[PDB]
Amino acid sequence: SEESQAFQRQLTALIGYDVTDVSNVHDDELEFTRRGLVTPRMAEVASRDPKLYAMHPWVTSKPLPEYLWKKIANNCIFIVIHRSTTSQTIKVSPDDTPGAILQSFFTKDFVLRVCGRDEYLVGETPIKNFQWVRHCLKNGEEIHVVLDTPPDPALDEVRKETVSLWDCDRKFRVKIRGIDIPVLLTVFVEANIQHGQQVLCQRRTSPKPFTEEVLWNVWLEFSIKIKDLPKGALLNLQIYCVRLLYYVNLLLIDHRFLLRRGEYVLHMWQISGSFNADKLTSATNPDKENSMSISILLDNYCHPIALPKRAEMPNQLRKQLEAIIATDPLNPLTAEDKELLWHFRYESLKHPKAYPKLFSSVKWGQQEIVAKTYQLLARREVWDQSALDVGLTMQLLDCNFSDENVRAIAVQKLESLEDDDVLHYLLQLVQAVKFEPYHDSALARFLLKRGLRNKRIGHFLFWFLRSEIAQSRHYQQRFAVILEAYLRGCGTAMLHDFTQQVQVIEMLQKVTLDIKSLSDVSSQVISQLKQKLENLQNSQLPESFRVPYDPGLKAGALAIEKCKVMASKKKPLWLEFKCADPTALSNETIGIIFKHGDDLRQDMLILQILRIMESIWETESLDLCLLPYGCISTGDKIGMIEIVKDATTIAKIQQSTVGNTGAFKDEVLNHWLKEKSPTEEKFQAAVERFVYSCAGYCVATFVLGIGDRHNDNIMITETGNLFHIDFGHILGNYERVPFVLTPDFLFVMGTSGKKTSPHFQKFQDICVKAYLALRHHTNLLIILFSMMLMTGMPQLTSKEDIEYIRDALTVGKNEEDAKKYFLDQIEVCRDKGWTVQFNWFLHLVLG
Numbered sequence: 080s081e082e083s084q085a086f087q088r089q090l091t092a093l094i095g096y097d098v099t100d101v102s103n104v105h106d107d108e109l110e111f112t113r114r115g116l117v118t119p120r121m122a123e124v125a126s127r128d129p130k131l132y133a134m135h136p137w138v139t140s141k142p143l144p145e146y147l148w149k150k151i152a153n154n155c156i157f158i159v160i161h162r163s164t165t166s167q168t169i170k171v172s173p174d175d176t177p178g179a180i181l182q183s184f185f186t187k188d189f190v191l192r193v194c195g196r197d198e199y200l201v202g203e204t205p206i207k208n209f210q211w212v213r214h215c216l217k218n219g220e221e222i223h224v225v226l227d228t229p230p231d232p233a234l235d236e237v238r239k240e241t242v243s244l245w246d247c248d249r250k251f252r253v254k255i256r257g258i259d260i261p262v263l264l265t266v267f268v269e270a271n272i273q274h275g276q277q278v279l280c281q282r283r284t285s286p287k288p289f290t291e292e293v294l295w296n297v298w299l300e301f302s303i304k305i306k307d308l309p310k311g312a313l314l315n316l317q318i319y320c321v322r323l324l325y326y327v328n329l330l331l332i333d334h335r336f337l338l339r340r341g342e343y344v345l346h347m348w349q350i351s352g353s354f355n356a357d358k359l360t361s362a363t364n365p366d367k368e369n370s371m372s373i374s375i376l377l378d379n380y381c382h383p384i385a386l387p388k389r390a391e392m393p394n395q396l397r398k399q400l401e402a403i404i405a406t407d408p409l410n411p412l413t414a415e416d417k418e419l420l421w422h423f424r425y426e427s428l429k430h431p432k433a434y435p436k437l438f439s440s441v442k443w444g445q446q447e448i449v450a451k452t453y454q455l456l457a458r459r460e461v462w463d464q465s466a467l468d469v470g471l472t473m474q475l476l477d478c479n480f481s482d483e484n485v486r487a488i489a490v491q492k493l494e495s496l497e498d499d500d501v502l503h504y505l506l507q508l509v510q511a512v513k514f515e516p517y518h519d520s521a522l523a524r525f526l527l528k529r530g531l532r533n534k535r536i537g538h539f540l541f542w543f544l545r546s547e548i549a550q551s552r553h554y555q556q557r558f559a560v561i562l563e564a565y566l567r568g569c570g571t572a573m574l575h576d577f578t579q580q581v582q583v584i585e586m587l588q589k590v591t592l593d594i595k596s597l598s599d600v601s602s603q604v605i606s607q608l609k610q611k612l613e614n615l616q617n618s619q620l621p622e623s624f625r626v627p628y629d630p631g632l633k634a635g636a637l638a639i640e641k642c643k644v645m646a647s648k649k650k651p652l653w654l655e656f657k658c659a660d661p662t663a664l665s666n667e668t669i670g671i672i673f674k675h676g677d678d679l680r681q682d683m684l685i686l687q688i689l690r691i692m693e694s695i696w697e698t699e700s701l702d703l704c705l706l707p708y709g710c711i712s713t714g715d716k717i718g719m720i721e722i723v724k725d726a727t728t729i730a731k732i733q734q735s736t737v738g739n740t741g742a743f744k745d746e747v748l749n750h751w752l753k754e755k756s757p758t759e760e761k762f763q764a765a766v767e768r769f770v771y772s773c774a775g776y777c778v779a780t781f782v783l784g785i786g787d788r789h790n791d792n793i794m795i796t797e798t799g800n801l802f803h804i805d806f807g808h809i810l811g812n813y814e815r816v817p818f819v820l821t822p823d824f825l826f827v828m829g830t831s832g833k834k835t836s837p838h839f840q841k842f843q844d845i846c847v848k849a850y851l852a853l854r855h856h857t858n859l860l861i862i863l864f865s866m867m868l869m870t871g872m873p874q875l876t877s878k879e880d881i882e883y884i885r886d887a888l889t890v891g892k893n894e895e896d897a898k899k900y901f902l903d904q905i906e907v908c909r910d911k912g913w914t915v916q917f918n919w920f921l922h923l924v925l926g
């Protein structure tokens with residue numbers, strides 16, 4: 080085969096790493112996992128309905144929220160069906176099927192698409208339940224359909240494809256031959272057997288002089304028995320001299336359940352600059368010329384050794400147990416707590432809330448305990464039956480659980496999330512893949528299934544993986560094998576779509592990096608920008624291409640005219656495009672920023688948390704009006720960002736009538752708003768939208784501990800909606816304010832200095848509801864914030880950083896104590912006025 084063999088050269092193109100390579104493995108686990116994934120891919124490609132798949136309706140079973148029924152006149156939604164230019168309006172009921180809006184139009188074969196978008200209102204679902212509709216209602220807008228012909232399913236077609244460990248009482252051991260580094264103190268090697276961040280045993284070698292080569296040739300006997308090693312155990316090898324210098328890991332029980340034996344030479348990872356996820360990888364360093372290396376031997380018998388495969392209680396105790404179950408994810412367990420959870424494990428099994436703590440009371444270094452823990456997993460009914468709790472589910476998937484049966488039951492719980500909910504957590508489920516001991520895992524397969532099943536999940540899963548494959552040497556192989564599996568099943572139609580997007584953005588990067596090397600901006604630089612963008616619009620670049628942060632959008636021709644290079648430290652591009660779709664109601668460009676020099680992974684994590692907060696507020700009928708704009712990492716330290724329309728900085732609004740100073744004037748923003756409002760009616764709404772959006776960002780920003788911001792990184796729209804930007808900037812550099820509530824903001828609210836008003840009391844009372852709303856999900860947010868810090872921004876691990884959020888969410892405190900607490904934060908804002916903002920001005924503009 081060849082035509083079905085040049086293919087892999089395209090996949091290796093889309094993936095961005097050569098999955099067939101072997102230059103950096105010490106076993107066949109990746110190969111075994113690729114083979115492993117073939118079955119779940121074809122299972123799902125065969126199992127998906129061709130229609131619904133090709134048109135990926137975007138649907139939701141959650142109730143239509145209150146604040147949107149009130150926006151429906153009376154059981155009456157208006158849709159505008161476009162033919163050519165012969166429009167037409169219809170009175171449709173919220174509970175109306177989409178087809179039925181054809182038994183009601185073919186009365187005065189075909190499918191309804193959305194004007195300007197790749198979105199289809201298809202399938203048996205009430206229109207109240209299509210996201211694009213809900214997006215229309217929320218922003219008060221006519222719903223436009225183009226009414227045309229189905230895409231053809233046939234274009235989504237995929238092209239044609241021994242001794243039992245439990246009989247070994249010998250203490251386990253490993254020989255350290257020694258270490259070699261090509262180029263350079265006293266030095267030694269530390270060997271740990273870890274399971275799930277739990278350390279089972281430790282031994283070291285004697286210290287030695289640090290030279291180009293250091294040999295010991297010692298056996299290190301561990302205090303743990305061969306039969307007592309759990310599946311997922313890591314041998315963790317480290318090098319000290321006290322500071323840590325190099326680490327590497329090796330699974331002691333391989334993907335085949337074999338105790339691991341023989342000679343191993345492993346190139347090790349360095350430490351730059353408390354644990355992030357890179358510390359956990361089974362992947363060996365690819366870079367050999369440079370990397371410290373270690374050489375070991377594992378005993379090597381014949382001799383394949385395969386890992387095989389309730390009463391009452393007092394009352395002081397029960398309440399002690401209840402107090403433990405309740406405590407938050409980050410609150411530590413004493414030995415005393417653990418022995419208690421374990422002894423009363425059966426009474427602990429009735430409370431799913433308890434599972435994270437129960438399965439952390441387990442000594443995984445003991446066969447018989449693990450064996451009892453598996454009996455525990457067989458009596459799992461209460462967990463199996465209870466309503467899905469994503470907060471619970473994520474905790475079992477973090478770095479604290481290495482047993483795959485514990486992790487599998489969390490994944491079981493996820494299988495019952497509707498698509499919509501999958502998109503909310505997708506980014507973090509993919510980061511959670513870094514915590515899996517093995518390349519092939521239930522969570523890895525599950526992400527594969529849900530992608531292959533829904534082009535929308537699938538489009539994002541593509542980019543999230545490609546971002547990691549592009550900037551993570553620790554996990555690229557594994558992510559490569561998951562991407563590869565996904566691409567070989569998405570459909571040739573998707574495959575061509577992904578290829579377009581890749582071709583375009585790769586070009587644009589080149590431009591970006593190139594203009595970047597010429598350096599505020601010279602009109603020499605402004606010149607080449609326009610020039611290269613003209614090159615592109617030629618005989619390479621395809622006509623259009625899906626915008627990656629918003630898959631429903633096709634971008635077409637650029638707008639050379641409007642595109643610019645901005646005056647940042649780095650030189651990011653400000654590009655704009657035409658909607659490639661003629662059926663577009665408007666003619667506004669699609670505006671996208673391109674930047675090198677920031678790791679955009681971190682901004683992605685924050686934005687997606689923001690969407691989750693907006694989703695938590697919808698449960699309580701709150702719309703705090705955030706603008707979590709699109710952001711997609713596409714490669715090392717580089718990617719794109721969506722541009723929000725009709726928006727300036729708050730600092731620019733000040734600099735407009737004070738001119739680069741700090742003489743910030745309390746009345747300037749409310750004057751800018753009135754300045755841009757055609758009616759005092761629109762103006763009132765922009766003031767209403769301000770109060771919500773600003774409150775919304777005070778709470779979220781405060782919980783996430785990124786509320787103390789420079790005035791240049793807070794923006795607003797000509798319509799009152801306020802939003803923060805550039806979250807990577809405070810995260811990735813690290814007198815104080817909790818969030819940013821400034822004299823100009825308060826002034827817009829009807830309060831001066833130390834006063835009060837109907838809008839400010841509206842403000843405070845949206846904050847309180849908001850703040851309390853999030854604390855109802857204290858466990859969700861604590862695990863997400865913790866997993867965020869671990870997989871996304873190293874340096875910000877330590878532990879002490881991770882625990883900021885417990886303080887913020889005020890765990891333990893009762894609502895009334897908590898309500899008061901936030902209001903006091905607001906009051907720290909009223910007190911400092913322009914202080915910090917002025918400080919941020921001196922520092923960030925004058926050093």
Ligand SMILES: COc1ccc(-c2cc3c(C)nc(N)nc3n([C@H]3CC[C@H](OCCO)CC3)c2=O)cn1
Pocket residue numbers: 645646672674677679682708720721722723724725726727728731794804805806807808
């Ligand atoms: C993590 O990296 C980054 C980098 C850039 C942004 C970013 C987002 C943004 C959005 C979503 N919407 C609108 N409307 N603008 C935006 N801007 C503008 C700020 C003012 C600037 O003007 C400088 C001369 O005054 C022009 C660009 C941004 O920078 C966010 N994160």
